[PDB]
C-alpha cells in the first residue's frame, strides 16, 4: 500500500518517482536500527524519514497525513475512521460534519480546526505520529549510496547547505557548474580523479546539459569511501531520466516554513553587542521570510530573501559595531541601511519598501525592552556580561518561546481574513489531494 502511494506520487511529478531497491534498502534499515506491530511502526517512521526529503512542503503534508491515516485506520476502530474522514472532509470543503465523541488527540484536532487554524491542523499529524525528521546532513550521513541529487524550485539554491555540510565533515567540495563542453570535460576529468583518489564533487544545474546527463551520467552511475557526487536540478525544469534519478538519493530543498524553527536554524548556523545584533538579525530574517510567502497581502509580489542578504547584513552590523565603539550605536543608520540597502535592494515596489521599513523600525528600535513578538521580550545586554554568557542567555530565552497556532497573523501583525483565506486554500488543496489519493 505504501509503495502504491509512492508510485502515485511519482505519477504526479517526475522527480517523485520511486524504485524497489530504495524501498527494500529502507526496509533493511528498519531492522538495522506486540512485535509485528512494532516492526510495522518502525517501518512507517523509517520510510517517512527516508522519503519525505524527496518531496516539497505540500507533498510532505500530504504524505504525512495519508501515512498517519493508513496507520490509524489499520489500528483504530470505525468510529475513528468516520471522525478522521469527516475532519479531512471539512478540511477539504467537501463534506461538513461534527465528529463523534469517544480519545484525546481527535479532540485536539477538533480544537485546532474549529479555531480556523489550518496549517497547524495539517502539521498536527506530523507532530503526533512521526517523531523524527531528516535534513540534508541526515540524508548524506545515513545513505549507503555515494551518488546524491538535489532539487529545488527556481530563485532558490541550496549550494551553501552542501558547502556547510562538507565543511562540518572536513571534506573538500568542488563545484563544477554545467552548461558548456569545457565544464563537461573538466567534470569528466575531475570525476575520474575523485573516484581514483577520493574527494567530493558537486555538479550545478544539470538540467542545462541534458544530452551529457542522459549519456555520460547514465553510463557512469549505472556502472572509494571519501567520494560523493552531488547534482542540483530545478523542479520546474525539463524532465530528467527515470533510472538515473532512481539510482541516486533525491532531496528537495526548500526554506523552513516555521518562524521559530528558522530562528533556531539561523542561530545554530552561527562582544555581547555582536551577539545581540546577530540574534536580532536572525529574528528579522525569519520574520521577513515568513511574511514573504504571503503573495497578495503580506507583500505585493514574490520576493526571495536568501542567506546572502543575512551575511551582508551581519557584516554591516559588525562593521558598525566595530567602528562605533563609543556605545552610541547608530540604530537609525542601521535601520535605514538594512531596510534600504541590504534587504531593500531586491524590492521593486514602494508599499513593500514601506512594510520592510516598518519591520526594521519594529525589530531595530534599540530600546531596553524590545517586544519583537507578542510573546517574547528581548532585553538589552548588560555592561558586565561575557560573550558566552550572552549567547547562553539568548539561547535560553529563544528555547522557552512557544510558537502560537496563529503565528502567521499575530507575529506578522496582519489582518486575519487574508491569512485565514491563504491557510484555508492551502489546507483545502492538501486535503483534497489526500482524499483523491486515499480512495484508490
Amino acid at each position: 500500500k505504501i509503495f502504491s502511494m509512492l508510485e502515485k506520487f511519482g505519477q504526479f511529478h517526475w522527480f517523485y518517482g520511486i524504485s524497489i531497491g530504495q524501498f527494500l534498502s529502507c526496509f533493511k534499515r528498519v531492522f538495522i536500527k506486540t512485535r509485528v506491530d512494532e516492526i510495522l511502526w518502525l517501518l512507517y517512521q523509517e520510510v517517512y524519514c527516508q522519503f519525505s526529503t524527496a518531496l516539497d512542503k505540500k507533498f510532505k503534508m500530504i504524505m504525512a497525513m495519508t501515512m498517519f491515516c493508513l496507520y490509524k485506520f489499520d489500528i483504530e476502530s470505525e468510529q475513528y475512521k468516520e471522525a478522521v474522514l469527516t475532519m479531512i472532509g471539512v478540511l477539504s470543503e467537501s463534506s461538513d460534519g461534527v465528529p463523534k465523541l469517544t480519545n484525546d488527540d481527535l479532540r485536539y484536532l477538533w480544537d485546532y480546526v474549529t479555531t480556523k487554524s489550518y496549517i497547524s491542523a495539517l502539521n498536527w499529524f506530523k507532530n503526533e505520529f512521526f517523531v523524527d525528521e531528516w535534513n540534508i546532513a541526515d540524508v548524506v550521513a545515513n545513505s549507503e549510496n555515494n551518488y546524491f541529487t538535489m532539487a529545488s524550485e527556481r530563485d532558490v539554491d541550496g549550494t551553501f547547505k552542501l558547502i556547510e555540510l562538507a565543511k562540518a565533515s572536513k571534506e573538500s567540495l568542488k563545484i563544477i557548474p554545467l552548461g558548456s563542453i569545457e565544464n563537461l570535460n573538466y567534470a569528466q576529468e575531475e570525476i575520474s580523479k575523485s573516484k581514483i583518489e577520493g574527494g567530493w564533487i558537486l555538479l550545478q544545474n544539470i538540467q542545462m546539459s541534458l544530452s551529457w546527463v542522459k549519456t555520460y551520467l547514465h553510463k557512469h552511475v549505472e556502472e572509494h569511501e571519501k567520494f560523493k557526487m552531488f547534482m542540483t536540478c530545478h523542479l520546474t525544469g525539463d524532465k530528467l531520466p527515470a533510472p538515473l534519478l532512481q539510482r541516486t538519493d533525491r532531496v528537495v530543498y526548500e526554506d523552513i516554513p516555521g518562524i521559530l524553527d528558522t530562528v533556531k536554524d539561523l542561530w545554530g548556523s552561527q562582544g555581547v553587542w555582536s551577539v545581540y545584533c546577530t540574534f536580532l538579525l536572525s529574528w528579522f530574517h525569519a520574520l521577513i521570510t515568513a511574511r514573504t510567502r504571503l503573495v497578495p497581502h503580506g507583500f505585493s509580489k514574490k520576493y526571495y530573501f536568501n542567506d546572502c542578504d543575512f551575511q551582508f547584513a551581519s557584516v554591516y552590523l559588525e562593521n558598525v559595531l566595530a567602528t562605533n565603539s563609543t556605545n552610541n550605536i547608530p540604530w537609525a543608520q542601521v535601520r535605514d541601511h538594512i531596510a534600504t540597502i541590504v534587504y531593500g535592494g531586491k524590492i521593486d515596489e514602494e508599499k513593500d519598501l514601506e512594510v520592510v521599513a516598518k519591520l526594521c523600525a519594529h525589530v531595530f528600535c534599540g530600546s531596553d525592552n524590545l517586544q519583537i513578538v507578542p510573546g517574547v521580550r528581548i532585553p538589552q545586554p548588560l555592561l558586565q556580561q561575557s560573550e558566552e554568557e550572552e549567547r547562553a542567555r539568548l539561547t535560553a530565552i529563544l528555547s522557552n518561546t512557544i510558537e502560537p497556532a496563529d503565528s502567521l497573523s499575530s507575529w506578522l501583525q496582519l489582518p486575519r481574513e487574508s491569512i485565514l483565506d491563504y491557510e484555508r486554500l492551502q489546507a483545502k488543496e492538501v486535503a483534497s489531494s489526500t482524499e483523491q489519493l486515499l480512495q484508490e
Binding site: 530563485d155 557548474p177 565544464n183 544545474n205 562593521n319 535605514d336
Partner: protein, 897 residues
C-alpha cells in the same frame, strides 16, 4: 608584411622563441622582397593568413605581458607591436585601452603628456625619453604609472592651493578636472565635518551659494574646455549645496549624522607614505580606495537620491568583493550610475554589451582580460546571455570573487594561470521581464547584490540641468516639464511605443541646449525642444492631445532647409505636400540632436523617400559628401551581421556592420573625416538583432565585440531604422532612438502617378506622347475608379495605394512597345489606342488579383467610369487593330505520343 617585420623581422632577441616561425617569416621575407623587386622593375595573402594562425600563442603571451592589450584585436596588436620606432600607431589605440585618452603628446622623441577625449590636456610629471630599441609594453607600463603619479601631483598641489584659502574660480583654470573635483570633495567633507562638530550650518551654506553663483557667472565668459569644467564642478557644487541644505533642515543631531553617513565622503589619510593609496572614499561606513586613474571631463550625472542609494549599495557589494546588480525597466540610469560610481572612485568603468554570441570561452576571456588589468567591468544587458552560458560562467565569477576576497595572487581560468589584480570588480545591469531574454540562475544571482531602480527622479535632473544652462526660472520650468510628461503619458492612447520616461527628457534637454542662440534661454526654447522631440513620434488624435496640453500647462526661419528639400525633391521628381514637408522637417530637426532614428509607418507609406530626399537636402545645405550603407537586418544572420568566432583556431571574423564600422574608424584615405555615414536597417527590429547594439545606441557609442574589440561610434556616424511595425520591438531600443511615426501616407494619388510617370520617362516626339498620357490620366475619373476598386475582394491583400506602380509601369511599357506604329495614324486613333492600353493596364493592375467575375465587374466599371475606345474582356491589339481572343486560338492536333 610591415606588421610581421615589426614583430619579427626587425626586433632582436625575439626570434629565439619560435625557430620554425622565424624560418617561415624569413621565407615570407624573401617572397615579399622578390614581389617588391618584380613590382618595382593572392598566394601571398594566403601565406600571410596561414602564418597568422601560429601567432595566436605569441599574441596571448604579449597580452599577458601588458594586460590592457586584451581590449585590442589581433590586427591592432600587430600594429601596436610593430611600431618599434614610429610610436604614432600606439596613440590611435589609447581610446581602446584606456577609454578616456585619445592621443599622446610627443616632443623630440619623448613623451610629455596625454590628451583626454573631451579635449583636456594632462601634463606628465616627468618627461620620459623613448629609446629606439625599447618595446611597447615597457613604456606603456611606465606611462600608466606616470599618469597616476601626475594625477596625484595635480590633486595634491590643487588641494594645497585650496587649503591656502584661494577661491576655486582661479584654480579651475590651472589643473585637470579630476584634481579639482577630488580636492573640492575633500575640502567639502572636511568643512562639513567641522560644521557637524557644532550646530551651525548657515554660514557654510551661504558661502557655497555665493561660490555657486560666482561659478555660474564665470560660466558664460569662459572657453569651451573651461565651460565643460565649470559645468561639471557646478553639478558637483549643486550636490554640495543640496547636501548642506538637507543637513541644515535636520531637527536633531542623530538624523543629521545619519544623513551625513548615507552620502559619499572623500577622505585622505595623513600617515601613509604611499602616494597612490592616500585617498579613500567612505560611504555608510565602508571604505574604498581611489585609483587615481585619468578620467577627463565626463558628462557628470546629477546626484539624485536614487543615485546616492545606488552608490551606497554598490559600495556595500564591493566591500565583500561581490558584484553590482542593477535591475529595472529600461531608461532609468543603471549603466550611467555604474559609470558615475567608477568616476567618483577615479577609474574608467569598462562596459560590455552581452549577447547570445558570448559563449563560455568569450566571456571567460573577457573576465581574464579585466581581472589582469584591474579595471571595473560592467556587463550591460546580462539577461541577453544564454542560460547555459550564464550557469557555466558562475564558476569563473565565484572564483574571481573568492580570489579577490582571500587576496590570492593568481587564479586559474581557461586552463591557464593568470595574475589577479586586487582593483578589479564586476557589475551587471539587466532588464527583467522582457521578451527574448533568459533568466539568471540563483547560484549566479547569489554572487551579485541586487538593487531596483524602477522610479528615478526626473524633476531634480531637469531642474539641475536647466540651472546648468542658467535658466531664469528653473524650478517652475522643471515642474512644468515633468507634470506635462506625466499628463502626456496618462492622457494618451495606450500604444506600445509611447514611452515618456527619462531618455526623452534627456533628449529634450539636449535639444534645448543648442537653441539658446536662436530662441533664447526660456519658455520658447523648451516648448520648441519638446515639440521637436516628442511631436514626430505621436499619432493623430494624440497630436491634438499634445497640442492641447502644451497650450494648457505652458502659456506659449528655416527657409534655407525647406528650399533645399524642395530642390532635392525637384531633382528626384517628388512633390511637397503638407504631410511630406512636415515629415521632412520633423526628421531633420529630430536627427539634429539624436544620432539614432526609427522610421515607423505602413508599408509603402513614404519612409525611404523621406530620408533619401532629406539626405539630398543635407548634401545641398552643408556641402558634405554623403555615403549611405543600407543593410537588411533579418536577411543576414547574427553571425554574418556582427561577427563570428572560428572555433577551430580561436580567431575573430568581422560581420557586415562591424566591417563598415572598422573601415570608417580606420579612415585610410581621408574620405570619412568630412562626410556623413548612414547605416539603415531596412527590416524588422528583432530584439535579438538590435539589442546587441544597445551600447551603440545610447551615450556609450561603443560596440563591444566578443573578442574584446571596442569600436567607438564617430559623431558623424548615424543609424536609421526603417520598419513597418513595432509589435515585437522591445522598449529598450525604442527609448534609445528618436522615433518618427507615419500616421498617414505622405503622398497623394495624383502626385504618385506624376512621380512614377516622371521616373518612367527618366528611365527611357516624346513630349507629345507624355502630354497625351498625362491628359489621359484624368484625376476626376481615376479617384472614383480607385474608390470603387476597394469593393472587390482581392487575394493577397494589397492596398490600392501600392498598386499604382504596377499600373504606370505596365502602361508605359505598353506605349513604349507600340510606339513603333504610332507615326502613321491620326490623333483620335492614337488617343483611342493609348486609352485602351491604359484601361487594360489599370484592369490587370487593380483587379488582376481577383476572380473572373470580379474582373468582368471591374472592366464594366472602368468602361462606365471613363467616347473613348471600349475595353472588352478579350480585347487586344494586333499588328494596330483592335481584335478579340476568338481568332488567336491556333488549331492544335496532338499526336498520340
Amino acid at each position: 608584411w610591415l606588421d610581421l617585420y615589426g614583430i619579427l623581422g626587425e626586433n632582436l632577441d625575439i626570434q629565439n622563441f619560435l625557430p620554425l616561425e622565424t624560418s617561415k617569416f624569413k621565407s615570407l621575407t624573401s617572397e615579399y622582397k622578390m614581389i617588391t623587386t618584380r613590382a618595382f622593375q593572392k598566394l601571398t595573402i594566403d601565406s600571410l593568413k596561414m602564418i597568422k594562425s601560429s601567432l595566436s600563442t605569441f599574441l596571448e603571451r604579449q597580452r599577458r605581458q601588458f594586460p590592457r592589450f586584451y581590449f585590442l584585436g589581433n590586427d591592432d596588436l600587430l600594429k601596436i607591436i610593430g611600431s618599434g620606432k614610429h610610436h604614432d600607431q600606439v596613440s590611435k589605440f589609447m581610446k581602446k585601452m584606456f577609454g578616456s585618452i585619445e592621443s599622446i603628446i610627443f616632443f623630440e622623441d619623448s613623451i610629455t603628456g596625454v590628451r583626454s577625449v573631451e579635449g583636456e590636456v594632462l601634463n606628465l610629471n616627468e618627461k620620459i625619453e623613448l629609446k629606439d630599441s625599447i618595446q611597447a609594453q615597457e613604456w606603456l607600463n611606465i606611462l600608466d604609472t606616470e599618469i597616476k603619479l601626475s594625477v596625484f601631483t595635480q590633486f595634491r598641489d590643487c588641494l594645497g592651493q585650496l587649503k591656502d584659502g584661494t577661491d576655486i574660480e582661479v584654480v579651475v583654470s590651472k589643473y585637470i578636472f579630476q584634481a579639482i573635483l577630488l580636492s573640492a570633495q575633500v575640502m567639502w567633507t572636511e568643512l562639513v565635518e567641522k560644521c557637524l562638530q557644532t550646530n551651525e550650518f548657515s554660514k557654510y551654506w551661504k558661502e557655497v551659494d555665493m561660490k555657486i553663483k560666482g561659478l555660474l557667472d564665470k560660466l558664460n565668459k569662459s572657453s569651451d574646455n573651461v565651460k565643460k569644467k565649470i559645468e561639471a564642478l557646478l553639478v558637483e557644487y549643486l550636490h554640495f549645496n543640496n547636501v548642506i541644505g538637507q543637513l541644515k533642515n535636520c531637527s536633531t543631531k542623530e538624523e543629521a549624522r545619519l544623513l551625513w553617513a548615507k552620502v559619499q565622503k572623500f577622505y585622505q589619510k595623513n600617515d601613509t607614505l604611499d602616494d597612490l593609496n592616500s585617498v579613500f572614499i567612505s560611504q555608510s561606513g565602508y571604505l574604498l580606495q581611489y585609483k587615481f586613474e585619468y578620467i577627463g571631463i565626463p558628462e557628470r550625472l546629477i546626484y539624485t537620491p536614487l543615485l546616492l542609494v545606488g552608490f551606497a549599495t554598490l559600495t556595500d557589494s564591493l566591500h565583500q568583493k561581490y558584484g553590482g546588480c542593477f535591475f529595472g525597466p529600461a531608461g532609468t540610469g543603471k549603466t550611467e550610475t555604474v559609470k558615475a560610481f567608477g568616476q567618483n572612485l577615479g577609474r574608467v568603468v569598462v562596459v560590455f554589451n552581452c549577447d547570445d554570441s558570448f559563449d563560455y570561452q568569450v566571456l571567460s576571456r573577457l573576465l581574464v582580460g579585466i581581472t589582469q588589468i584591474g579595471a571595473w567591468g560592467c556587463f550591460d544587458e546580462f539577461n541577453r546571455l544564454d542560460e547555459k552560458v550564464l550557469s557555466a560562467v558562475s564558476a569563473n565569477i565565484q572564483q574571481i570573487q573568492n580570489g579577490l576576497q582571500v587576496g590570492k595572487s593568481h587564479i586559474t581560468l581557461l586552463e591557464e594561470e593568470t595574475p589577479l589584480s586586487p582593483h578589479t570588480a564586476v557589475f551587471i545591469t539587466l532588464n527583467p521581464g522582457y521578451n527574448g531574454r533568459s533568466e539568471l540562475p540563483e547560484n549566479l544571482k547569489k554572487s551579485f547584490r541586487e538593487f531596483s531602480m524602477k522610479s528615478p527622479q526626473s524633476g531634480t535632473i531637469a531642474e539641475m540641468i536647466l540651472q546648468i544652462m542658467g535658466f531664469e526660472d528653473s524650478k517652475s520650468l522643471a515642474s512644468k516639464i515633468v507634470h506635462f510628461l506625466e499628463l502626456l503619458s496618462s492622457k494618451c492612447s495606450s500604444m506600445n511605443h509611447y514611452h515618456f520616461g527619462l531618455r526623452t527628457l534627456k533628449g529634450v534637454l539636449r535639444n534645448c541646449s543648442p537653441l539658446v542662440s536662436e530662441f533664447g534661454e526660456g519658455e520658447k526654447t523648451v516648448v520648441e525642444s519638446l515639440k521637436r522631440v516628442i511631436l514626430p513620434s505621436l499619432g493623430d488624435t494624440d497630436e491634438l492631445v499634445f497640442k492641447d496640453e502644451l497650450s494648457k500647462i505652458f502659456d506659449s526661419n528655416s527657409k534655407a532647409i525647406v528650399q533645399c528639400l524642395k530642390d532635392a525633391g525637384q531633382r528626384s521628381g517628388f512633390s511637397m505636400s503638407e504631410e511630406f514637408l512636415k515629415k521632412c522637417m520633423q526628421f531633420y530637426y529630430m536627427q539634429k540632436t539624436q544620432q539614432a532614428l526609427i522610421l515607423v509607418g505602413k508599408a509603402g507609406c513614404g519612409k525611404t523617400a523621406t530620408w533619401k530626399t532629406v539626405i539630398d537636402a543635407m548634401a545641398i545645405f552643408d556641402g558634405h559628401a554623403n555615403v549611405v550603407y543600407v543593410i537588411d537586418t533579418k536577411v543576414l544572420t547574427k553571425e554574418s551581421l556582427y561577427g563570428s568566432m572560428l572555433k577551430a583556431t580561436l580567431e575573430w571574423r568581422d560581420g557586415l556592420f562591424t566591417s563598415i564600422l572598422r573601415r570608417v574608424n580606420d579612415d585610410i584615405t581621408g574620405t570619412f573625416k568630412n562626410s556623413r555615414i548612414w547605416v539603415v536597417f531596412d527590416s524588422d527590429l528583432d530584439p535579438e538583432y538590435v539589442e546587441a547594439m544597445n551600447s551603440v545606441l545610447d551615450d556609450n557609442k561603443i560596440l563591444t565585440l566578443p573578442n574584446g574589440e571596442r569600436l567607438p561610434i564617430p559623431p558623424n556616424f548615424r543609424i536609421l531604422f526603417e520598419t513597418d511595425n513595432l509589435d515585437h520591438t522591445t522598449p529598450a531600443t525604442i527609448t534609445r532612438c528618436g522615433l518618427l511615426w507615419f500616421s498617414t501616407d505622405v503622398c497623394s494619388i495624383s502626385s504618385k502617378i506624376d512621380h512614377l510617370l516622371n521616373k518612367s520617362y527618366e528611365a527611357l516626339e516624346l513630349d507629345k506622347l507624355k502630354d497625351l498620357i498625362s491628359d489621359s490620366f484624368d484625376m476626376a475619373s481615376l479617384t472614383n475608379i480607385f474608390t470603387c476598386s476597394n469593393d472587390l475582394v482581392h487575394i493577397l491583400g494589397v492596398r490600392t495605394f501600392n498598386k499604382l506602380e504596377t499600373a504606370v509601369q505596365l502602361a508605359v511599357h505598353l506605349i513604349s512597345s507600340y510606339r513603333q506604329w504610332f507615326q502613321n495614324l491620326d490623333d483620335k486613333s492614337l488617343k483611342d489606342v493609348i486609352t485602351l492600353l491604359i484601361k487594360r493596364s489599370l484592369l490587370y493592375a487593380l483587379a488582376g488579383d481577383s476572380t473572373g467575375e470580379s474582373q468582368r465587374a471591374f472592366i464594366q466599371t472602368i468602361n462606365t467610369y471613363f467616347d473613348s475606345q471600349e475595353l472588352s474582356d478579350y480585347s487586344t491589339i494586333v499588328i494596330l487593330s483592335f481584335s478579340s481572343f476568338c481568332s488567336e486560338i491556333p488549331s492544335v492536333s496532338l499526336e498520340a505520343h
